[PDB]
Amino acid sequence: LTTFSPTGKLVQIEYALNRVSSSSPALGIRAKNGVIIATEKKSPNELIEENSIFKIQQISEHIGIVYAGMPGDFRVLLKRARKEAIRYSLQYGSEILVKELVKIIASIVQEFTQTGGVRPFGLSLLICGVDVYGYHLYQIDPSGCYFNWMATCVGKDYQNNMSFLEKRYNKDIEIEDAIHTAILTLKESYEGVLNEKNIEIGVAYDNKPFKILTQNEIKDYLIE
Amino acid sequence: MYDRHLTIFSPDGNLYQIEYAIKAVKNTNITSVGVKGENCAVIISQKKMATKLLDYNNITNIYNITDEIGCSMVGMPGDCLSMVYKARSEASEFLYSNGYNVNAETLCRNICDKIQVYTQHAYMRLHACSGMIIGIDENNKPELFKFDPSGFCAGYRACVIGNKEQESISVLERLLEKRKKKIQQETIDEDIRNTTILAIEALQTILAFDLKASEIEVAIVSTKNRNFTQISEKEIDNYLTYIA
Amino acid sequence: RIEDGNNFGVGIQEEAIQELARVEESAFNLYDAIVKYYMERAKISTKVLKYPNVSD
Amino acid sequence: QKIKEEYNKFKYDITKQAIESLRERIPKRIIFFNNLVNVNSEPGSILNVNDLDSHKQIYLELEKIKTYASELIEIIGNIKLWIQLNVPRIEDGNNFGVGIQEEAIQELARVEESAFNLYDAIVKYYMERAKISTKVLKYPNVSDYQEAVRELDEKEWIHIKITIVDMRNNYIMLYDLLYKNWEKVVKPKN
Amino acid sequence: QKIKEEYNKFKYDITKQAIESLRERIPKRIIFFNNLVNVNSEPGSILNVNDLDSHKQIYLELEKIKTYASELIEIIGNIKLWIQLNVPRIEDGNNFGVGIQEEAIQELARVEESAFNLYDAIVKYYMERAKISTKVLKYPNVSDYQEAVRELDEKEWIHIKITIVDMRNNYIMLYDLLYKNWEKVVKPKN
Amino acid sequence: YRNLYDTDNIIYSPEGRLYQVEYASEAIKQGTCAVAIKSKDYVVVSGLKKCISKLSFPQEKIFKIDDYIGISMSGITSDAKVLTKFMQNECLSHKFLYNENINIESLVRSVADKYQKNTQKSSKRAFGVGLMIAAYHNEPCIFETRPNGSYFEYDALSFGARSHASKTYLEKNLHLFEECSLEELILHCLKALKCSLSSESELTISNTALAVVGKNHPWQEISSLQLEEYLSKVK
Amino acid sequence: AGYDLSVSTFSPDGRLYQVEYIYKSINNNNTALCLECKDGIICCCINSNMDKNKMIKKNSYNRIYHVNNNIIITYSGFDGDARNIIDRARSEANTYYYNFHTNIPLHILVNRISLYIHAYTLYWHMRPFAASIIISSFNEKDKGDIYCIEPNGACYKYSGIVIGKNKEMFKTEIEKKDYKDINVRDAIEDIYKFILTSNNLQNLVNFSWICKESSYEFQNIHEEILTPALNKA
């Protein structure tokens, strides 16, 4: 059970934030014709494959999501994210808006913080996608709050990677220009020079369904 | 401290009851390696007491969840049998609720999902087990999925679970290299003779054992068989002599 | 590296260092003890020279 | 490998010596010291001064004390070492038997320290007696210095006898302790 | 077999002595010391220096002290060992009675060690008084040295009597303690 | 000897014992003495009441379940009136759902689980009591329970403060089986209390409850005007 | 030191206490014995608790329970926590009889009883069981099979097994013969010789074999088959 601290904060929540600062780094950037989300698929060996370990997932036809924490907590918050994207699509006609999806998933993460006997969620999401009012790229902090970010990073070393974006991101940036600055911020902090088909990138691509870039497509951008 | 319970994070942000549970699997000295080739995937057990007069034909480490999806749960001898029933009563619950037969990836992602709910709640303890769910799907493509006491639906082309996972990655890598770079296009579904030899050579390279005849029982889930057939003893002793 | 939890193995290491320092300190003290032997025997011997009939 | 044989022989030789000492060497000494200071004696008949005459009488008694002290430290030292070699690998939990072993080491080390401390204390007697005796030659009419010598001899004499009782009693507290907890001392984690 | 008989005989002879001490030796001395320092005495009639005229009178009082101190160590030493021989095999939990036994050993060892320290204290009296007496001989007109001698005897005279009170108070508190906790001292776990 | 394995019903000691249940088995020794003798066809029970104060009436020790089944608790009372009611309702329901008498061996198994199911949980504590079920169905049997689930079809029992002194009286008395002697059987059972009664004290002037059950005997409580004529005046 | 209080807490090496301490409990109570024979399966029980009571009946402390006609079950350890598994063992045979109208086979009863014993070693609120159960039977066309389900699951199929205060001494004596030789009748003499070696002349034991070609069902010894007991060899 999480309890308050004498200095006026949550101790168990603060340890959850120390978990997202020690996992695979993610990166979300919002452009003027869609949004993009990146990650760092750290290959441990040549035994695992690429068709199963995913740091990019889908919720609906226009909703992207990445993680920054526990790998085992992938398939649990994603299961409830799809069900709330389906339950909203049953009681209402169209798809689920990103603001109506984040305000629902945040009510699930927050509920798993105040209720006794449970452990706070050890991950930081990045829900992105096309909305009827434009483009959004939210972030779900393990405490339960959220931010309407424009361009951010949540994994390991999110301090220097955040400064590498403030000096390399204007308000008007196209998707092809944002992809080049996405891989640039990853290599500026990722160890080694093995950045070769080890990044999974999703893209909204200006009012079109979510298309996860394949391995033969990411090499086209990495060479530039 | 911060290790007596399960639902509490450590000050450095790291769960320890999960970490101790993986050490329980790497303490029962049972190693089960499985490889997956082209439309043929096998799994090898070790047949040893998880720690005279015992019937050595009954002690095993291979259980079938359904008629076409087998696995090999290693770890504590009391938690492995329970995880088979939490899977046997799950895949059997899928066919009744969905008509078509369940897949190997849907079963592993459902087992890892049930394991994760015991992590957030401090009700029960973690099941100290680790199995390699094997089987083929409708698209005639074999799979493999290894899950530790945490949530992991990773999936491998060849994996080894047990107390040797700390350094048994290089041996399985060199053996897969000797088959990918030496691929034979004249494959007439004879992989049950080729992929099985690659697997027994893997376990014999990890553990330096001379005559592992009665203490090795494998299973093949290749196409044209599709039944998770446990290979008999005569075929095992025959396969053990092809290393010469 | 010092970490919180799962440091049962450092306890084995710490136990060895504690015992190793104990044995080392004991052996190190022999050098001081030998000086005490010569110092005490010399001090007593001076008194024997000054008072040669007190037999104790 | 040649050293390993001689070394294994040594570990074997210790194990033998420990049981033999517990089964023969220690009980024989129990009866020996008991025959010198019988428990059935009336109070004050032990701790008396009837046999009280350098003090040649105390000298002869001190030599025997050092013999008794030497044999105790040597006997206990091998028993203590034997228990140390029988301590299992340190583990978290299920170490109730290690506590029993540890309990044995604490009592064994306490008695060993007591016998070890007898040799320095005897030096203190002569050192204190020598300083006062010089004062008697220098100051022959202050009678308390002569009384101090007399009383000092009576003090060492009584302390020697309390030590002999302490020898006997340490052997008994030790024999009874290992005998009662013998199964957990040998196999502490079964 | 000879060692086995003498040892079992030893445990029996002690057990007798412990009961003998509690039924006779300790109560007889309780009334004895009480007859010397009666609890019903009016204040100041016990702890005084009124009957005080080397100090031959003090010498005679210390001789009586030495008798009382010697006999106590012998009785308490055997009673304490008897409780030690009655401690059951060490087990985890349900050893509150063993705690009582340890508590009993703690009180018995404290009183025995306290009385034991009188032997060192009497030597300190003669050594310190003789040293001061040398100073009186060297400087006979500084009156504070002579006053120190007078005061030294009065302090020791009081300490001797407080020791007798300490004897008296320890004997009754020890007997009453074992009496109240008798069921747990003999059968601490049943 | 860290004694950390002592305050819960779940923690096991390293020796293998369960100290929270072992404390309940020791709680039956702090009760009054009781003894039951099994003859060839009769069963008696000699319960000794606990007259606490001088003005207060003595407490009741011998109870009743049916016409042939009678118990006699020996331990705390708060866990005796609950086990009696959760025995009588398991007795009258057998005479209502069916019509024959309840099988005494099948009744105790339903009472042992009332101990067992009250031990495994942590929120619930063990029953600190010791029952002495004396009954006669086809053959006279004297059953007894414990805080731990355990059964022993005895032939002569004892529970109490001075239970060991009466245990020794029955250990050397095996001639109770052959000669029944109902008029003399109660003399043996009353002697079992007198041989272990408060360090040579009388306390038998209508202060020791008795009960007899046998062949054609229902749970007859021995009247206060019948046990003092000769049953209490033998020696 | 701190990691052995509850059952839902692991140890840093990987082991698990409070399911481990139970092994020191079942190895200190009254032992058991059950071994294969060429004619059937013969159990045993050595109630080594004479000295404390001596007032119980002759054959009143029986410990050979059975679920139905031909499956014998014994204990080791806590008599209370072992009877609770028998009720789950008997109710499992009845539920299988309702839903399937057949006798429950042993390779499915020992699995349904394993997920019951092991299931109590997970909840923090409940305590684990304290018993080692022996389960066996003897088919007509197949030989016997003894399953020694210990705590924490592990339903291992043995062929001769003892569990109690001398679980390591009889194993050095059971190996004196293969026992897939001489019948269940003469095997009693070989069993009774083992008890006296490792403790006097008392009738506290109570065994029960399953087959003497007596319809292959459970029965006790008899009062006439215990009498020819060789008290010397």
TrEMBL record, chain A:
Where is this chain primarily localised? cytoplasm
Official protein name in the record: Proteasome subunit alpha type-2
Tell me where in this chain the Proteasome alpha-type subunits domain is found: 1-19
Protein's UniProt keywords contain Transport:
no
Q: What are the GO MF terms of this UniProt record? A: endopeptidase activity
- Organism the protein comes from: Plasmodium falciparum (isolate 3D7)
Where is this protein found?
Cytoplasm; Nucleus
Highest taxon of the lineage: Eukaryota
UniProtKB/TrEMBL annotation, chains D, E:
Q: Which UniProt keywords apply?
A: Proteasome
One example of the protein's molecular function in GO is: endopeptidase activator activity
List the GO cellular component terms.
cytoplasm; nucleoplasm; proteasome activator complex
Under Gene3D superfamilies, the record lists:
Proteasome activator pa28, C-terminal domain
GO BP term, example: regulation of G1/S transition of mitotic cell cycle
Stretches assigned to the Proteasome activator PA28 C-terminal domain = 54-190
Indicate whether Lipoprotein appears among the record's keywords.
Answer: no
**Does the keyword DNA repair belong to this entry?**
no
InterPro entries attached here? PA28_C, PA28_C_sf, Proteasome_activ_PA28, Proteasome_activ_sf
Family of the protein in this entry: Belongs to the PA28 family.
Question: What protein name is recorded for this chain?
Answer: Proteasome activator 28 subunit beta, putative
Automatic annotation (TrEMBL), chain F:
Query: What Gene Ontology molecular-function terms does this entry list?
Result: endopeptidase activity
- Where in the cell is the protein located? Cytoplasm; Nucleus
Please provide, in alphabetical order, the Gene Ontology terms of the cellular component aspect for this entry. Answer: cytoplasm; nucleus; proteasome core complex; proteasome core complex, alpha-subunit complex
Q: Which CDD domains match?
A: proteasome_alpha_type_1
Q: Which InterPro entries match?
A: Ntn_hydrolases_N, Proteasome_alpha, Proteasome_alpha-type, Proteasome_alpha1, Proteasome_asu_N, Proteasome_sua/b
Proteasome alpha-type subunits domain residues are 5-27
Tell me which PROSITE patterns the record gives.
Answer: PROTEASOME_ALPHA_2
Which GO BP terms sit in this record? proteasome-mediated ubiquitin-dependent protein catabolic process; ubiquitin-dependent protein catabolic process
- Name the SMART domains for this protein: Proteasome_A_N
Q: What keywords is this UniProt entry annotated with? A: Cytoplasm, Hydrolase, Nucleus, Proteasome
- The principal location of this protein is cytoplasm
Record's keyword annotation contains Hydrolase: yes
Q: Does Hydrolase show up as a keyword for this record?
A: yes
User: EC number(s) of the enzyme?
Assistant: 3.4.25.1
Q: What class of enzyme is it?
A: hydrolase
Annotated family: Belongs to the peptidase T1A family.
This chain's protein is named Proteasome subunit alpha type-1, putative
According to its UniProt entry, this protein's organism is Plasmodium falciparum (isolate 3D7)
Automatic annotation (TrEMBL), chain G:
Xref: SMART domains:
Proteasome_A_N (SM00948)
Which Cys-Cys disulphide bridges does the record give?
34-43
The answer to whether UniProt assigns keyword Ligase to this entry is: no
Q: Could you list this entry's UniProt keywords, alphabetically sorted.
A: Cytoplasm, Hydrolase, Nucleus, Proteasome
- Gene Ontology molecular function terms on file: endopeptidase activity
Q: Which Pfam families match?
A: Proteasome (PF00227), Proteasome_A_N (PF10584)
Per UniProt, subcellular location reads as: Cytoplasm; Nucleus
- Give the EC class as a word: hydrolase
Protein name per UniProt: Proteasome subunit alpha type-3, putative
Q: What is the lineage of its organism?
A: Eukaryota, Sar, Alveolata, Apicomplexa, Aconoidasida
